[PDB]
Amino acid sequence: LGTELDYDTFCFYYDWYGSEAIDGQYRHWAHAIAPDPNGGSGQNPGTIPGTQESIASNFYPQLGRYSSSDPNILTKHMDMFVMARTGVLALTWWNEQDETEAKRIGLILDAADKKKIKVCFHLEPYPSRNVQNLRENIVKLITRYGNHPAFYRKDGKPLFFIYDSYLIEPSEWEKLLSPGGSITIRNTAYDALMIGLWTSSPTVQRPFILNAHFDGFYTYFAATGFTYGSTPTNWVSMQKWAKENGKIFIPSVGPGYIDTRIRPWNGSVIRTRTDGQYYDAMYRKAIEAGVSAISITSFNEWHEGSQIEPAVPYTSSEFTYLDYENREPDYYLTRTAYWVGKFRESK
Ligand SMILES: OC[C@H]1O[C@H](O[C@@H]2C=CO[C@H](CO)[C@H]2O)[C@@H](O)[C@@H](O)[C@@H]1O
């Protein structure tokens, strides 16, 4: 029918939003404003309070200030994934070691399964992250969730995205990811496809990826040109290198970028949506590069303005939000479905 989910399409999902009613605070809708790293001492940037009028986004959710723990929101999000044809939800994972995290992960897996969506984890730069506690956490996640019907596998293997994987030296990664490594997961019950973050130039990244024994790489950033990896004119050559070296390249595409409510000094990174033309251009470059898998930044990173989740026009007494302009609130979901179809036609 040309409507089915694609299980080589990964959409980055954030479960960090809270409401007073469910979570005790409007978590993440309220957010600290970052000081300017070049703006000197004594800055008092303040906070966005997460009121109805003033939330930590330049856009405004159709679903309002929702809780990521609300089963009825999760249902709606899974229906949005179905509309977008995105078969894998790539869940932010911060190693919070708290019961409210555990509850949310279970709720997300359960809701996903009702719609045949799969879930993988996006391993974030949590405090003192290192290859030993990464192994322990991979073991825990596979043990806890590996028998859940929504747990993602590719040819029998789980898959993890590793954000800011450059914060760990290749000599450490080798211990976890080489078949001969001291604490290897290879050939164990806990083996997985490990997808590292390609940032800078090939001269740095090629030996990093090889020496670290990653199975593949992704680029994350929705803003074109932010890094070498997030410059789509490099994707043909990145894919050629991946194929030559038996690596999986999963370029990240997004619909735009703007984070100036939380980072007012970061205007140079703004990428305008132009009624969908930015998203179209980026998605076309990924498909044209001949890749096997694509990642989408993001479902709902509202702070960074990369979301495809529906947004509505809103002007409050405190802020005039951006909105999808000439496009309807669900445009980025249905445009994702269009591109998934083009990707499948190519695959
Ligand atoms: O956008 C604010 C957000 O920024 C950091 O999180 C990263 C932002 C986007 O994606 C990556 C990969 O998922 C995240 O690690 C972090 O400082 C958050 O605390 C903050 O809310």
Tab-separated table of C-alpha atoms and ligand atoms in Angstrom:
chain	number	residue	atom	x	y	z
A	1	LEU	CA	0.000	0.000	0.000
A	2	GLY	CA	2.965	2.414	0.428
A	3	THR	CA	1.892	3.141	4.032
A	4	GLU	CA	3.902	0.608	6.095
A	5	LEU	CA	6.492	1.456	8.707
A	6	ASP	CA	10.147	1.541	7.714
A	7	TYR	CA	12.451	-0.236	10.166
A	8	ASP	CA	15.635	1.363	8.795
A	9	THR	CA	14.325	4.841	9.741
A	10	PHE	CA	15.226	5.998	13.262
A	11	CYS	CA	13.620	9.038	14.826
A	12	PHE	CA	15.295	10.633	17.869
A	13	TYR	CA	12.787	10.822	20.730
A	14	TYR	CA	12.995	12.692	24.034
A	15	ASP	CA	11.113	11.493	27.156
A	16	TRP	CA	12.190	14.302	29.458
A	17	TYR	CA	9.018	16.450	29.459
A	18	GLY	CA	6.956	16.779	32.607
A	19	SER	CA	3.726	18.275	33.910
A	20	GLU	CA	2.989	19.465	37.403
A	21	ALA	CA	0.080	16.991	37.654
A	22	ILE	CA	2.011	13.841	36.677
A	23	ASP	CA	5.662	14.708	37.448
A	24	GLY	CA	5.462	17.451	40.093
A	25	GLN	CA	7.019	20.068	37.783
A	26	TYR	CA	6.695	21.134	34.110
A	27	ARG	CA	10.019	19.460	33.477
A	28	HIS	CA	11.978	20.664	30.431
A	29	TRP	CA	9.178	23.058	29.405
A	30	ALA	CA	10.943	25.010	32.170
A	31	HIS	CA	14.674	25.183	31.382
A	32	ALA	CA	17.751	27.191	32.314
A	33	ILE	CA	18.955	29.729	29.774
A	34	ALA	CA	22.573	29.039	28.869
A	35	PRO	CA	25.175	31.799	29.384
A	36	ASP	CA	27.076	32.881	26.296
A	37	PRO	CA	30.393	30.932	26.295
A	38	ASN	CA	32.027	34.025	24.725
A	39	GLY	CA	30.129	36.633	26.771
A	40	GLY	CA	32.333	37.039	29.843
A	41	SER	CA	31.812	36.696	33.590
A	42	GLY	CA	28.887	37.737	35.731
A	43	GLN	CA	26.099	36.726	33.349
A	44	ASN	CA	22.733	36.043	35.009
A	45	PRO	CA	20.859	34.463	32.103
A	46	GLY	CA	17.929	33.233	34.191
A	47	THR	CA	15.413	30.554	33.319
A	48	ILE	CA	12.390	29.968	31.189
A	49	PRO	CA	9.611	29.178	33.652
A	50	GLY	CA	7.590	26.614	31.682
A	51	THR	CA	4.299	28.467	32.124
A	52	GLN	CA	1.610	28.177	29.484
A	53	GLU	CA	2.809	31.474	28.088
A	54	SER	CA	6.593	30.857	28.278
A	55	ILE	CA	8.094	27.472	27.395
A	56	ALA	CA	11.634	26.455	26.459
A	57	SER	CA	11.090	26.325	22.698
A	58	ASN	CA	10.804	28.753	19.829
A	59	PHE	CA	7.777	26.641	18.688
A	60	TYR	CA	4.665	25.504	20.570
A	61	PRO	CA	3.430	21.881	20.737
A	62	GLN	CA	-0.024	20.978	19.413
A	63	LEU	CA	-0.269	18.715	22.479
A	64	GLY	CA	0.656	21.558	24.894
A	65	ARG	CA	2.938	21.153	27.917
A	66	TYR	CA	2.656	17.402	27.961
A	67	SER	CA	4.111	14.752	30.236
A	68	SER	CA	6.298	12.079	28.703
A	69	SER	CA	4.837	9.783	31.426
A	70	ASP	CA	1.211	10.329	30.298
A	71	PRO	CA	0.046	7.086	28.604
A	72	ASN	CA	-2.493	9.054	26.562
A	73	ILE	CA	0.296	11.326	25.137
A	74	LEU	CA	2.354	8.243	24.366
A	75	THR	CA	-0.562	6.742	22.431
A	76	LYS	CA	-0.808	9.915	20.353
A	77	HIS	CA	2.923	9.961	19.709
A	78	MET	CA	2.831	6.368	18.447
A	79	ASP	CA	-0.005	7.300	16.074
A	80	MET	CA	2.232	10.179	14.847
A	81	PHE	CA	5.093	7.705	14.214
A	82	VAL	CA	2.647	5.590	12.180
A	83	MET	CA	1.659	8.648	10.140
A	84	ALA	CA	5.357	9.462	9.545
A	85	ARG	CA	6.174	5.818	8.668
A	86	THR	CA	9.104	5.922	11.097
A	87	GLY	CA	9.476	2.398	12.429
A	88	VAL	CA	12.143	2.971	15.099
A	89	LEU	CA	11.966	5.318	18.071
A	90	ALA	CA	15.537	6.133	19.212
A	91	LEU	CA	15.027	6.932	22.898
A	92	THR	CA	17.279	9.387	24.747
A	93	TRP	CA	18.866	7.579	27.701
A	94	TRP	CA	20.533	9.513	30.515
A	95	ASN	CA	21.097	6.764	33.105
A	96	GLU	CA	18.972	8.567	35.695
A	97	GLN	CA	18.749	5.477	37.975
A	98	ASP	CA	15.295	6.425	39.165
A	99	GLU	CA	12.008	4.743	39.278
A	100	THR	CA	10.246	7.419	37.217
A	101	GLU	CA	12.716	6.702	34.281
A	102	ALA	CA	12.072	2.995	34.571
A	103	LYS	CA	8.321	3.559	34.488
A	104	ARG	CA	8.537	5.792	31.433
A	105	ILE	CA	10.707	3.365	29.442
A	106	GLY	CA	8.201	0.568	30.093
A	107	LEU	CA	5.280	2.766	29.078
A	108	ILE	CA	7.047	3.746	25.846
A	109	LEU	CA	7.861	0.143	24.924
A	110	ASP	CA	4.273	-0.934	25.617
A	111	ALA	CA	2.744	1.903	23.584
A	112	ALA	CA	5.181	1.358	20.714
A	113	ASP	CA	4.345	-2.332	20.490
A	114	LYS	CA	0.632	-1.639	20.040
A	115	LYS	CA	1.514	0.085	16.751
A	116	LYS	CA	4.380	-2.250	15.723
A	117	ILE	CA	6.961	0.475	16.404
A	118	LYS	CA	10.379	-0.601	17.670
A	119	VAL	CA	12.556	1.110	20.278
A	120	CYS	CA	16.322	1.467	20.510
A	121	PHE	CA	18.406	3.524	22.950
A	122	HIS	CA	20.385	6.700	22.308
A	123	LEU	CA	23.118	6.536	24.963
A	124	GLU	CA	23.787	10.052	26.221
A	125	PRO	CA	26.929	11.507	27.894
A	126	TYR	CA	25.921	10.714	31.462
A	127	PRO	CA	28.322	11.481	34.377
A	128	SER	CA	31.547	9.454	34.336
A	129	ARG	CA	30.388	7.470	31.298
A	130	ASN	CA	33.168	5.025	30.391
A	131	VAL	CA	33.384	1.679	28.625
A	132	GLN	CA	33.003	-0.358	31.845
A	133	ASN	CA	29.778	1.285	32.996
A	134	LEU	CA	28.601	1.368	29.362
A	135	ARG	CA	29.015	-2.393	29.246
A	136	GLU	CA	27.157	-2.755	32.537
A	137	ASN	CA	24.339	-0.561	31.238
A	138	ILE	CA	24.121	-2.380	27.892
A	139	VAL	CA	23.867	-5.636	29.842
A	140	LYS	CA	21.125	-4.131	32.030
A	141	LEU	CA	19.119	-2.767	29.095
A	142	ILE	CA	19.328	-6.015	27.111
A	143	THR	CA	18.484	-8.086	30.212
A	144	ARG	CA	15.545	-5.846	31.258
A	145	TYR	CA	14.061	-5.076	27.844
A	146	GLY	CA	15.501	-7.574	25.351
A	147	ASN	CA	12.486	-9.866	25.487
A	148	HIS	CA	10.011	-7.007	25.046
A	149	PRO	CA	8.354	-7.350	21.616
A	150	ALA	CA	9.155	-3.706	20.778
A	151	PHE	CA	12.910	-4.000	21.479
A	152	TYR	CA	14.662	-3.273	18.184
A	153	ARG	CA	16.919	-5.822	16.489
A	154	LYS	CA	18.671	-5.757	13.115
A	155	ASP	CA	19.630	-9.264	11.892
A	156	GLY	CA	19.357	-10.484	15.487
A	157	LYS	CA	21.386	-7.688	17.109
A	158	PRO	CA	20.273	-4.780	19.265
A	159	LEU	CA	21.418	-1.317	18.108
A	160	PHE	CA	22.651	1.659	20.156
A	161	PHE	CA	23.442	5.207	19.078
A	162	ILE	CA	26.299	6.667	21.137
A	163	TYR	CA	26.097	10.450	21.445
A	164	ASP	CA	29.414	12.376	21.767
A	165	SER	CA	31.322	9.072	21.400
A	166	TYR	CA	34.460	11.216	20.839
A	167	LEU	CA	34.528	11.927	24.582
A	168	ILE	CA	35.973	8.350	24.933
A	169	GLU	CA	39.325	7.391	23.434
A	170	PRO	CA	39.509	4.663	20.769
A	171	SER	CA	41.856	2.670	23.011
A	172	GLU	CA	39.018	2.460	25.563
A	173	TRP	CA	36.375	1.672	22.930
A	174	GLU	CA	38.560	-1.178	21.605
A	175	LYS	CA	38.267	-2.950	24.971
A	176	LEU	CA	34.479	-3.092	24.575
A	177	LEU	CA	34.097	-3.366	20.800
A	178	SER	CA	37.020	-5.315	19.338
A	179	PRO	CA	36.410	-9.087	19.252
A	180	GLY	CA	39.641	-9.357	21.297
A	181	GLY	CA	38.871	-6.558	23.700
A	182	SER	CA	39.368	-7.035	27.425
A	183	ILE	CA	35.647	-6.553	28.159
A	184	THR	CA	34.290	-7.308	24.717
A	185	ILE	CA	30.611	-7.642	23.917
A	186	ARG	CA	31.431	-9.356	20.602
A	187	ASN	CA	30.276	-12.997	20.467
A	188	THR	CA	28.426	-12.599	23.766
A	189	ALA	CA	24.756	-12.449	24.676
A	190	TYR	CA	25.172	-8.671	24.831
A	191	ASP	CA	26.578	-8.049	21.359
A	192	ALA	CA	25.020	-5.047	19.585
A	193	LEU	CA	25.440	-2.713	16.622
A	194	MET	CA	27.219	0.336	18.055
A	195	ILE	CA	26.724	3.520	16.037
A	196	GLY	CA	29.147	6.316	16.967
A	197	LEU	CA	28.869	10.024	16.298
A	198	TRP	CA	30.933	11.168	13.287
A	199	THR	CA	31.774	14.846	13.912
A	200	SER	CA	34.835	16.340	12.225
A	201	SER	CA	37.058	15.721	9.174
A	202	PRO	CA	37.851	12.309	7.677
A	203	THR	CA	41.498	12.587	8.747
A	204	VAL	CA	40.307	12.400	12.364
A	205	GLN	CA	37.100	10.381	12.076
A	206	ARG	CA	38.206	7.520	9.816
A	207	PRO	CA	40.928	6.220	12.153
A	208	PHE	CA	38.705	6.935	15.188
A	209	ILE	CA	35.854	4.749	13.857
A	210	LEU	CA	38.205	1.960	12.753
A	211	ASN	CA	40.324	1.929	15.913
A	212	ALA	CA	37.241	2.135	18.175
A	213	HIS	CA	35.588	-0.838	16.380
A	214	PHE	CA	32.220	0.883	15.930
A	215	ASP	CA	29.797	-0.892	13.634
A	216	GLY	CA	28.715	2.372	12.063
A	217	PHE	CA	28.217	6.067	12.496
A	218	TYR	CA	25.583	8.816	12.496
A	219	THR	CA	25.818	12.599	12.386
A	220	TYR	CA	22.939	13.865	14.635
A	221	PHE	CA	23.000	17.604	14.057
A	222	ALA	CA	19.971	18.992	12.262
A	223	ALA	CA	21.785	22.206	11.278
A	224	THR	CA	23.617	21.828	7.989
A	225	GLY	CA	27.266	22.762	8.192
A	226	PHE	CA	27.513	22.627	11.998
A	227	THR	CA	30.107	19.867	11.613
A	228	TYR	CA	31.777	18.133	8.658
A	229	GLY	CA	29.457	15.207	9.346
A	230	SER	CA	26.322	17.367	9.249
A	231	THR	CA	27.336	18.890	5.876
A	232	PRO	CA	25.264	16.854	3.407
A	233	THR	CA	27.569	17.387	0.425
A	234	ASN	CA	30.005	15.080	2.308
A	235	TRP	CA	27.531	12.214	2.530
A	236	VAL	CA	28.343	10.516	-0.796
A	237	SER	CA	31.992	10.231	0.202
A	238	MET	CA	31.170	9.206	3.780
A	239	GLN	CA	28.968	6.418	2.432
A	240	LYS	CA	31.705	5.260	0.010
A	241	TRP	CA	34.148	5.002	2.920
A	242	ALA	CA	31.558	3.182	5.060
A	243	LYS	CA	30.889	0.607	2.348
A	244	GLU	CA	34.641	0.056	1.768
A	245	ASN	CA	35.190	-0.521	5.500
A	246	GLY	CA	32.103	-2.592	6.368
A	247	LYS	CA	30.496	0.185	8.418
A	248	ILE	CA	26.851	1.277	8.590
A	249	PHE	CA	26.310	4.981	7.844
A	250	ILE	CA	23.065	6.408	9.240
A	251	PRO	CA	23.042	10.117	8.279
A	252	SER	CA	20.806	12.393	10.347
A	253	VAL	CA	18.298	14.672	8.630
A	254	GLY	CA	16.134	17.348	10.173
A	255	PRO	CA	13.572	19.970	9.253
A	256	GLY	CA	15.364	23.034	10.650
A	257	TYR	CA	17.138	24.301	13.757
A	258	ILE	CA	16.585	27.131	16.233
A	259	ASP	CA	17.482	27.124	19.927
A	260	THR	CA	17.554	30.808	20.788
A	261	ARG	CA	15.001	30.691	23.662
A	262	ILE	CA	17.498	28.553	25.633
A	263	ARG	CA	20.718	29.765	23.866
A	264	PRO	CA	20.025	33.426	22.849
A	265	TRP	CA	23.640	33.850	21.677
A	266	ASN	CA	23.463	30.876	19.252
A	267	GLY	CA	21.716	32.575	16.336
A	268	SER	CA	24.380	31.629	13.787
A	269	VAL	CA	23.174	28.010	13.979
A	270	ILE	CA	19.580	28.905	12.968
A	271	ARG	CA	18.397	27.039	9.882
A	272	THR	CA	15.054	28.261	8.540
A	273	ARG	CA	12.379	25.685	7.667
A	274	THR	CA	11.116	27.522	4.498
A	275	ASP	CA	7.757	25.683	4.383
A	276	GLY	CA	9.505	22.310	4.250
A	277	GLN	CA	12.150	23.041	1.627
A	278	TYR	CA	15.028	22.672	4.123
A	279	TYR	CA	13.785	19.233	5.207
A	280	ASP	CA	13.263	18.178	1.599
A	281	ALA	CA	16.783	19.179	0.620
A	282	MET	CA	18.412	17.347	3.514
A	283	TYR	CA	16.338	14.163	3.127
A	284	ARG	CA	17.060	14.101	-0.630
A	285	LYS	CA	20.810	14.274	0.050
A	286	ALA	CA	20.618	11.303	2.439
A	287	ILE	CA	18.687	9.204	-0.080
A	288	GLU	CA	21.001	10.226	-2.952
A	289	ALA	CA	24.053	9.172	-0.925
A	290	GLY	CA	22.808	5.554	-1.222
A	291	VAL	CA	22.633	4.791	2.481
A	292	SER	CA	20.915	1.787	4.053
A	293	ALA	CA	19.374	3.637	7.016
A	294	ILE	CA	18.438	7.194	7.923
A	295	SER	CA	18.014	8.951	11.270
A	296	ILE	CA	15.733	11.927	11.907
A	297	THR	CA	16.677	14.760	14.260
A	298	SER	CA	14.140	14.929	15.781
A	299	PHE	CA	10.693	13.796	16.800
A	300	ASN	CA	10.478	16.209	19.738
A	301	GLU	CA	13.693	18.075	20.623
A	302	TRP	CA	11.571	21.210	21.128
A	303	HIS	CA	14.416	23.196	22.689
A	304	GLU	CA	16.386	22.995	19.456
A	305	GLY	CA	13.575	23.518	16.994
A	306	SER	CA	14.355	20.319	15.124
A	307	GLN	CA	11.057	18.585	15.908
A	308	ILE	CA	8.702	17.011	13.357
A	309	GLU	CA	6.018	16.665	16.062
A	310	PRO	CA	2.994	18.887	15.308
A	311	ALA	CA	3.285	22.547	16.358
A	312	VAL	CA	0.567	25.191	16.405
A	313	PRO	CA	0.476	28.946	16.072
A	314	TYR	CA	0.586	30.661	19.459
A	315	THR	CA	1.110	34.179	20.618
A	316	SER	CA	1.048	34.680	24.356
A	317	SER	CA	1.622	37.752	26.456
A	318	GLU	CA	5.258	36.574	26.893
A	319	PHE	CA	6.429	35.323	23.452
A	320	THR	CA	5.335	35.077	19.832
A	321	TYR	CA	6.151	31.497	18.833
A	322	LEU	CA	7.236	30.319	15.422
A	323	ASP	CA	4.888	27.870	13.706
A	324	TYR	CA	4.687	25.751	10.551
A	325	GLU	CA	3.686	28.847	8.567
A	326	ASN	CA	1.954	27.965	5.335
A	327	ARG	CA	1.950	24.320	6.297
A	328	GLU	CA	-0.543	22.551	8.585
A	329	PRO	CA	0.536	21.249	12.055
A	330	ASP	CA	1.019	17.647	10.821
A	331	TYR	CA	2.926	18.627	7.690
A	332	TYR	CA	6.282	17.370	8.897
A	333	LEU	CA	4.765	13.967	9.778
A	334	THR	CA	3.201	13.542	6.373
A	335	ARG	CA	6.323	14.909	4.617
A	336	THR	CA	8.400	12.369	6.542
A	337	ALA	CA	6.089	9.664	5.178
A	338	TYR	CA	6.696	11.015	1.642
A	339	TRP	CA	10.473	10.773	2.102
A	340	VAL	CA	10.294	7.338	3.705
A	341	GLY	CA	8.498	6.231	0.540
A	342	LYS	CA	11.221	7.721	-1.670
A	343	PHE	CA	13.869	6.058	0.506
A	344	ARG	CA	12.151	2.676	0.168
A	345	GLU	CA	11.838	3.080	-3.563
A	346	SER	CA	15.684	3.558	-3.601
A	347	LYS	CA	16.660	0.941	-1.034
B	1	LIG	O1	18.554	21.151	23.847
B	1	LIG	C1	18.850	21.219	25.234
B	1	LIG	C2	19.487	19.962	25.776
B	1	LIG	O2	20.831	19.920	25.273
B	1	LIG	C3	21.580	18.792	25.673
B	1	LIG	O3	21.059	17.563	25.182
B	1	LIG	C4	21.471	17.258	23.824
B	1	LIG	C5	20.609	17.975	22.820
B	1	LIG	C6	20.193	17.407	21.703
B	1	LIG	O4	20.516	16.083	21.372
B	1	LIG	C7	21.585	15.466	22.124
B	1	LIG	C8	21.545	13.998	21.720
B	1	LIG	O5	20.276	13.425	22.059
B	1	LIG	C9	21.409	15.755	23.597
B	1	LIG	O6	22.485	15.156	24.331
B	1	LIG	C10	21.638	18.683	27.194
B	1	LIG	O7	22.415	19.771	27.697
B	1	LIG	C11	20.234	18.736	27.796
B	1	LIG	O8	20.335	18.732	29.222
B	1	LIG	C12	19.474	19.970	27.308
B	1	LIG	O9	18.130	19.925	27.790
